[PDB]
């Protein structure tokens, strides 16, 4: 009889919890009690980039740590040389309603998408001297919320239709679909090996996905409200999440659980962005009250604040050499800190 | 700087000029968000997303419709929200108040005013004169309400009070609601311009410290 499926699900919901609690011998704070503190940090603004006419919704760093791309309500992508501030290209969008952009790890291509349910791929290396669309990827039934390249021929995307998907750009078709979330999917992060990825959704959970097998490995469920941003730890063995809960949380793959949470009684607004420094010792988070907090990832202390925007911070990112932090905002600027 | 760097700097001046020139043309316009449930007449109040454009009295408008908890943050800087209500069914009319109370109180829409079209007044006049059913079975206060045709005037004013009440009870002064009735009607492009003029005038008084 069909009602017995709820009985079998209850037995397993107990067995997962019993296994996870048997591992819990000591906390990360009980181990890291003797390691020395970061002290205080004092990063300063080294550049301001100007030229968008409206809100900035996303940015992404290029593989060489010198180029970056930005996406805005004003209907343009812009590619910047961060050292000089010079604009390299400005690209006109076919819709104003973009929510995402990404840079290919070769520097040959850029991607964007949003409320029109399509992901567009732009070729930066034409013989005619232009930038133009190479491919339009269509098949989601809702707004695209994040995208990330694996190479010049494969890309992963997430949407408001509750799925993620993997695409072959040369064929213009899906090769796998990833199914199991019950809310809209907000954000996505690839592991350093590119064999796995994680995503977070408005049902207040995160999942671990096998790219090659096409299926779900583990699910993580500590939050009490929607997840907006997610990021792998540099070692590929842990990740962090940020939520409308007004807290960040660190999760471990091999212990299958939460290690610690970052929060304070004077912090009340939701988290828009999260990122890790090159050693993993600093965790950076962006907030709806328009400045960034910097946390000691092991001690859970707060080390300093990047105060400098006068409207909310919408995107965040650290260079692969660990030299600098970029932040974008609804004030139409983006700033670089060091 | 080198001979390549001064050439790459002159390129960026032409990008700055061409971005800024395209910034003047867009800022001429006004932007509208359109909302309303199925069979409300939303597609014909003027005659993954849809967009339509018009001009009246030398002012020109863009209007958007989506084929909403997350994406509504993208519309935090429109001039107005247009909200369309079916008045021909008394049964689903509670869903119209439930949707309206969500959009009015939303934390990212604290400064945007609403233009409200109560649609299908002809099917409402036909049913209130035919007399087979009564609003009072769904909204009991109609059994005691009387006016501020002599039959239909009682119904249409009561139904229009039910939206304006749930607005004014928590409006917080920054934004306003502008009701109208729609049928083969044609004037609706003038009605929205006469309210977009008033919204911009209400902003100009606060910027000059008059209010």
């Amino acid at each position, epitope marked *: 009889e069909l009602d017995q499926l709820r009985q079998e699900a209850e037995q397993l919901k107990n067995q997962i919890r019993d296994a996870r609690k048997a591992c819990a011998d000591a906390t990360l704070s009980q181990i890291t009690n003797n390691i020395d503190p970061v002290g205080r940090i004092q990063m300063r603004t080294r550049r301001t980039l100007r030229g968008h006419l409206a809100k900035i919704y996303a940015m992404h760093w290029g593989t060489d740590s*010198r*180029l970056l791309v930005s996406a805005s309500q004003d209907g343009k992508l812009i590619i910047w*040389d961060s050292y*000089t501030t*010079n604009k*390299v*290209h400005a690209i006109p969008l076919r819709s104003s309603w973009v929510m995402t952009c990404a840079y290919a790890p070769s*520097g040959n291509y850029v991607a964007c998408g949003g409320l029109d349910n399509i992901c567009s791929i732009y070729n930066l290396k034409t*013989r*005619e*001297g*232009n930038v133009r669309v190479s491919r339009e990827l269509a098949g989601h039934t809702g707004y695209l919320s994040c995208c990330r390249f694996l190479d010049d021929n494969q890309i992963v995307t997430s949407s408001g239709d509750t799925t993620c998907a993997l695409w072959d750009i040369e064929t213009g078709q899906q090769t796998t679909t990833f199914t199991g979330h019950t809310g809209d999917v907000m954000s996505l992060s690839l592991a350093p090996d590119t064999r796995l990825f994680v995503s977070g959704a408005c049902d207040a959970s995160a999942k671990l996905w096998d790219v090659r097998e096409g299926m779900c490995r583990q699910t993580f469920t500590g939050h009490e409200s929607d997840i907006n941003a997610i990021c792998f730890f540099p070692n590929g063995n842990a990740f962090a999440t940020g939520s409308d809960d007004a807290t960040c949380r660190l999760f471990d793959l091999r212990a299958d659980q939460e290690l610690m949470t970052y929060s304070h009684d004077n912090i009340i607004c939701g988290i828009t962005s999260v990122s890790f420094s090159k050693s993993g010792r600093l965790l950076l988070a962006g907030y709806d009250d328009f400045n960034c907090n910097v946390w000691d990832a092991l001690k859970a202390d707060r080390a300093g604040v990047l105060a400098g925007h006068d409207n909310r911070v919408s995107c965040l990112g650290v260079t692969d050499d660990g030299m600098a932090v970029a932040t974008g905002s609804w004030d139409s600027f983006l700033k670089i800190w060091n | *700087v*080198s*001979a*390549e*760097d001064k*050439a*790459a700097a*002159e*390129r960026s001046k*032409m990008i700055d000029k061409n971005l800024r020139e395209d910034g003047e043309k867009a800022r001429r316009t006004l932007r509208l968000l359109l909302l309303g449930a199925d069979n409300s007449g939303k597609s014909t109040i003027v005659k993954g997303i849809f967009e339509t454009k018009f001009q009246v009295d030398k002012v020109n408008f863009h209007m958007f419709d989506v084929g909403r908890r997350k994406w509504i943050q993208c519309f935090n800087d429109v001039t107005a929200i247009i909200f369309v209500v079916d008045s021909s069914d008394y049964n689903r009319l509670q869903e119209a108040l439930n949707d309206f109370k969500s959009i009015w109180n939303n934390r990212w829409l604290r400064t945007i005013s609403v233009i409200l079209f109560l649609n299908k007044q002809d099917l409402l006049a036909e049913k209130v004169l035919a007399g087979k059913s009564k609003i009072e079975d769904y909204f009991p206060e109609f059994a005691r309400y009387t006016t501020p045709d002599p039959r239909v005037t009682r119904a249409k004013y009561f139904i229009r009070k039910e939206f304006v009440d749930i607005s004014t009870a928590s409006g917080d002064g920054r934004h306003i609601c502008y009701p109208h009735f729609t049928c083969v009607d044609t004037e609706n492009a003038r009605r929205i311009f006469n309210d977009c003029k008033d919204i911009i005038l209400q902003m100009n008084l606060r910027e000059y410290n008059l209010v």
Partner: single-chain antibody
Amino acid sequence: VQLVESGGGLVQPGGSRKLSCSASGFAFSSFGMHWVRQAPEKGLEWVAYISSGSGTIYYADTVKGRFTISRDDPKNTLFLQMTSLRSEDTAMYYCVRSIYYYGSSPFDFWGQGTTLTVSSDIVMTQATSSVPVPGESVSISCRSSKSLLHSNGNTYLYWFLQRPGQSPQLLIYRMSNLASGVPDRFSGSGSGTAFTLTISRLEAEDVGVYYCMQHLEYPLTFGAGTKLEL
């Protein structure tokens, strides 16, 4: 992608001319444009430059005041107007496209020229004049009077290849980088002042002439270049 040219011919001393060149298949307004010349038995020499947006214009001292360079973007056309023509101006003239931003490769494509017959600069040298070369490696070297390496971390040296009877084409840009469609058997490297190009496994159709050019400062200057033989 194409550039085509008209003008040239025979001119009596002291006269004037206009050359014209028409682009097709590319975003012409976005490219900087150069005129480059060669005498009937001598190396490449640069004549003039005009920017994108017409905002800056350069000449060598041998043409300064006698020549005007101009463009007509709605018609995709490049012009050179020149007066007081001497026997010393008798040259093949080519136009060239260029574009400048982080990661670009200028001197990318060349027209096919019109021959004209009239009846503090960086000195750079190629040590050989001609070399006997198949299947073996071959190597060529160029030296500069001053350093081509700049505080920004780049070196502004280029290598050009000319096959017999054909316009020249780019091999290498900014000392190290290889131009699109050029075989992976080509390479080059150097110090701040002395540079080398290496060919691995030489073949037919690699036979030609090799020119080294600097782009540190205007005027742009060339070496004499080295010929190869089979």
